[PDB]
Amino acid sequence: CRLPPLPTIREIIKLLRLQAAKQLSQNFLLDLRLTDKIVRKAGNLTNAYVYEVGPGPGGITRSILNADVAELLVVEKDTRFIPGLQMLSDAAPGKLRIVHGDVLTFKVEKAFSESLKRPWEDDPPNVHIIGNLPFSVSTPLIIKWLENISCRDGPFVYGRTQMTLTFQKEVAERLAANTGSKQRSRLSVMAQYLCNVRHIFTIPGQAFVPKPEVDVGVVHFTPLIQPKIEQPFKLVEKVVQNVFQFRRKYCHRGLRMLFPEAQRLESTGRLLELADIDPTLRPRQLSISHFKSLCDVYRKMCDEDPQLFAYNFREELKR
RNA sequence: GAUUAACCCAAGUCAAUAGAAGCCGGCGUAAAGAGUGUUUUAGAUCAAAUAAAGCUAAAAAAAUAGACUACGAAAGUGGCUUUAACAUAUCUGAACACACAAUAGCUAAGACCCAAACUGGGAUUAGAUACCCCACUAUGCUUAGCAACAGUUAAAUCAACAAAACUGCUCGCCAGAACACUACGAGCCACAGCUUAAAACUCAAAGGACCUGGCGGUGCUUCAUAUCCCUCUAGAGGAGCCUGUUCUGUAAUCGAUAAACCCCGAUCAACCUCACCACCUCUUGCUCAGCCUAUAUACCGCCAUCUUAACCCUGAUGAAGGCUACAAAGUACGUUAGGUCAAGGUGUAGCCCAUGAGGUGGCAAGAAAUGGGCUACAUUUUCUACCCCAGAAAAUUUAGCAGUAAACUGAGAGGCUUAGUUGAACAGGGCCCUGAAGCGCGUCGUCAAGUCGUAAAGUGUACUGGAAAGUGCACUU
Ligand SMILES: [Mg+2]
Ligand SMILES: [Mg+2]
Ligand SMILES: [Mg+2]
Ligand SMILES: [Mg+2]
Ligand SMILES: [Mg+2]
Numbered sequence: 001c002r003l004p005p006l007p008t009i010r011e012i013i014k015l016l017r018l019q020a021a022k023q024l025s026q027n028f029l030l031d032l033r034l035t036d037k038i039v040r041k042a043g044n045l046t047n048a049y050v051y052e053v054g055p056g057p058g059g060i061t062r063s064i065l066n067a068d069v070a071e072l073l074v075v076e077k078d079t080r081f082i083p084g085l086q087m088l089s090d091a092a093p094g095k096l097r098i099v100h101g102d103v104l105t106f107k108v109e110k111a112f113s114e115s116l117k118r119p120w121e122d123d124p125p126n127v128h129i130i131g132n133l134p135f136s137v138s139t140p141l142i143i144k145w146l147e148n149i150s151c152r153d154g155p156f157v158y159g160r161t162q163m164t165l166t167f168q169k170e171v172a173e174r175l176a177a178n179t180g181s182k183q184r185s186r187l188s189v190m191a192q193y194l195c196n197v198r199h200i201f202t203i204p205g206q207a208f209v210p211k212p213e214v215d216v217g218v219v220h221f222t223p224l225i226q227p228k229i230e231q232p233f234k235l236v237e238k239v240v241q242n243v244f245q246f247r248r249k250y251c252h253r254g255l256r257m258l259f260p261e262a263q264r265l266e267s268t269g270r271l272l273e274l275a276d277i278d279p280t281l282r283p284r285q286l287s288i289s290h291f292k293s294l295c296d297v298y299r300k301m302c303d304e305d306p307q308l309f310a311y312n313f314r315e316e317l318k319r
Numbered sequence: 320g321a322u323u324a325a326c327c328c329a330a331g332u333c334a335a336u337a338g339a340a341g342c343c344g345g346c347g348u349a350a351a352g353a354g355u356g357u358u359u360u361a362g363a364u365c366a367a368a369u370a371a372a373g374c375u376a377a378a379a380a381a382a383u384a385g386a387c388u389a390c391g392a393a394a395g396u397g398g399c400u401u402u403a404a405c406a407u408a409u410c411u412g413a414a415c416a417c418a419c420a421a422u423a424g425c426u427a428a429g430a431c432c433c434a435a436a437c438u439g440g441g442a443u444u445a446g447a448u449a450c451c452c453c454a455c456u457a458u459g460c461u462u463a464g465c466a467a468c469a470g471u472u473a474a475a476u477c478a479a480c481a482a483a484a485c486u487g488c489u490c491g492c493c494a495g496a497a498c499a500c501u502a503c504g505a506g507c508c509a510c511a512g513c514u515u516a517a518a519a520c521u522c523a524a525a526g527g528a529c530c531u532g533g534c535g536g537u538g539c540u541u542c543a544u545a546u547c548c549c550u551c552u553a554g555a556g557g558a559g560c561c562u563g564u565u566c567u568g569u570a571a572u573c574g575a576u577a578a579a580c581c582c583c584g585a586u587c588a589a590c591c592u593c594a595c596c597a598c599c600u601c602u603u604g605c606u607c608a609g610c611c612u613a614u615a616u617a618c619c620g621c622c623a624u625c626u627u628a629a630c631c632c633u634g635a636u637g638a639a640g641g642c643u644a645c646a647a648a649g650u651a652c653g654u655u656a657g658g659u660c661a662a663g664g665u666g667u668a669g670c671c672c673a674u675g676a677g678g679u680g681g682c683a684a685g686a687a688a689u690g691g692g693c694u695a696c697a698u699u700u701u702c703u704a705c706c707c708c709a710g711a712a713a714a715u716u717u718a719g720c721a722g723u724a725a726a727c728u729g730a731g732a733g734g735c736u737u738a739g740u741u742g743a744a745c746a747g748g749g750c751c752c753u754g755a756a757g758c759g760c761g762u763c764g765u766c767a768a769g770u771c772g773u774a775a776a777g778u779g780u781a782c783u784g785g786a787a788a789g790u791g792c793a794c795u796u
């Protein structure tokens with residue numbers, strides 16, 4: 001399968017009409033070899049349906065097409081790259097389906113046929129997502145898709161679709177952080193009670209043609225058959241955010257803020273005691289089972305008190 | 320590895336192992352010396368502070384003085400008054416004694432004007448501003464808790480680099496990488512994660528200071544900037560023939576005349592003749608015949624192409640370096656599948672029932688777009704007399720630069736060489752490129768190495784869920 005040569009940075013500057021190399025405001029991975037590595041780590045893609053986000057110049061696109069995919073849905077925001085992607089599509093007829101639009105609003109649930117939809121408890125449904133997006137867009141995207149897994153909608157109408165996304169090295173570590181680690185944070189819990197998350201490898205900044213001052217991690221997500229917390233996404237998000245707002249103080253200092261001041265002291269204690277959270281646990285020392293306990297007790301407290309779930313302590317400190 | 324020869328020791332040789340064999344050397348940068356004061360058994364010779372009360376002026380914390388450099392052990396202290404008040408008559412000596420001081424990180428409560436990591440909300444490109452605006456947390460606040468000392472500048476000062484080297488006297492510290500790596504395990508946790516280590520082991524290094532450089536490099540700056548530009552000046556497209564290329568067409572050549580014609584120049588086809596096409600004939604014949612058929616892709620010739628050290632000083636006699644003019648170390652021929660067989664040769668090959676000699680017919684093209692050439696092209700003209708006061712007729716390109724362009728005459732060897740006459744127009748800006756110097760920059764990556772690809776700013780720490788890095792707090796130049 002012969003494909004067009006990859007565009008060098010010269011052609012890319014000419015294409016974006018910048019006429020210089022220090023005005024891109026973007027970093028491109030123009031190394032087909034690292035992209036081969038990433039597509040290898042994404043799994044066995046033979047006759048797979050790949051939803052590739054943030055195509056850009058097309059190193060990831062070329063790497064994926066080199067693997068024997070069936071359909072490769074591309075979603076590009078910029079129109080200066082559609083010409084190159086159209087040349088790629090013509091070089092490999094029938095495999096590249098290009099679309100123009102934002103990945104944060106694009107509806108993947110209708111993109112692929114309904115004959116690929118496997119049940120949730122069965123194997124991942126032969127539909128993969130691969131992404132090298134701006135880090136300013138991959139974090140909202142992963143939050144949105146985590147909500148989708150919690151609701152079993154969106155890209156996960158086909159089942160437990162696997163994701164391979166590039167994040168910043170720190171963000172990737174935090175996504176794949178263990179209990180007690182110095183990178184354990186909100187993002188770790190939020191990703192980990194819904195997915196098996198693996199930080200596979202780190203690409204140094206020197207490998208990107210405009211070299212960034214950061215490293216880039218590649219992280220693989222596989223939705224879990226049995227989520228570790230069976231509560232609504234927004235409730236878990238609220239609990240985790242209030243726990244982790246004070247990362248270096250005891251866990252109760254952050255949990256007291258879920259309740260109005262009037263009943264802060266007694267309600268916080270009731271929460272902790274109907275859970276079994278030792279109040280000397282600092283937030284990085286809480287496993288997903290501690291958060292499951294807190295979420296269950298908090299769901300109860302909300303269900304016998306309607307006003308609670310909408311409470312925001314800063315809206316009460318304003319007055 | 321074998322073999323030859325050599326070397327050492329020798330009734331031994333020498334592989335392994337183990338001993339013998341070593342601190343009066345150093346601690347800014349290589350391993351090793353500061354938070355401050357007091358005391359301490361011994362050893363040595365060197366016998367504008369601080370705390371209290373009160374009080375305040377401009378706008379709680381203190382402009383001017385302060386260009387001052389004082390007080391205090393250090394951290395620190397600079398609004399006014401008053402009261403207390405600023406140890407000690409030799410030095411060294413604390414992990415363990417007493418006082419202070421600062422730096423992290425958490426824990427309890429408390430205040431909250433203001434600011435503010437995180438967290439929400441609003442506005443913005445066409446991955447918006449990461450950056451603007453609003454609100455409000457942690458936090459910033461307040462408590463209580465977790466090398467010394469004395470003398471020297473004499474010497475060769477002087478591994479270098481810092482910060483000129485020194486002695487004496489005392490304490491502490493230092494004897495490769497290695498403040499290496501590693502979780503047998505332990506604690507917390509409670510099946511899967513976090514925190515916590517020395518030693519072995521391995522190696523011949525590790526470490527410190529300095530120097531040369533090299534980029535077959537990168538851009539720009541100014542001017543000399545002549546050729547080349549650009550401007551500017553003066554002429555050069557229509558018509559008729561002849562040539563170049565293309566397409567179309569034929570069996571074929573609208574091809575040539577030391578070989579026709581013409582007898583003004585030239586010329587087209589000529590029934591010349593050679594050349595081409597289609598048919599035939601001749602044969603030992605011309606004369607041991609006949610062809611200009613090839614070759615300089617044979618040489619020669621003629622043109623053209625390309626290539627063509629020493630000495631003396633400086634750095635402590637280290638790598639290393641050496642300039643000032645009102646002068647401070649510098650001086651001494653080949654090459655070519657080249658063209659030319661027309662003003663010229665010396666050879667070599669070819670066919671010899673044909674590459675020779677004849678005969679019968681045909682052949683005589685068409686069409687465009689463009690390239691080139693030759694003629695006539697006038698009123699500032701043409702004809703006569705005269706040699707200048709008469710009468711009759713009717714777009715690219717080439718040069719420029721001066722006796723040049725343009726126009727007009729003569730002489731030659733027989734398209735080329737020389738001698739004359741008349742005689743213009745324009746004449747301003749900038750470059751390529753060498754010349755003359757100056758500044759800066761600059762000193763690539765990756766999957767298994769290429770049979771790989773390509774040309775205000777910082778340092779920490781904390782949080783970060785719109786993180787290709789941002790913000791907050793404290794510091795540095
Ligand atoms: Mg023996
Ligand atoms: Mg040291
Ligand atoms: Mg003392
Ligand atoms: Mg505020
Ligand atoms: Mg001492």
Ligand SMILES: [Mg+2]
Nearest residue numbers: 572574682683
């Ligand atoms: Mg003819």
Ligand SMILES: [Mg+2]
Nearest residue numbers: 593610611675
């Ligand atoms: Mg003949």
Ligand SMILES: [Mg+2]
Nearest residue numbers: 615616657658
């Ligand atoms: Mg020749």
Ligand SMILES: [Mg+2]
Nearest residue numbers: 783786789790
């Ligand atoms: Mg942020």
Ligand SMILES: [Mg+2]
Nearest residue numbers: 779780790791
């Ligand atoms: Mg910072």
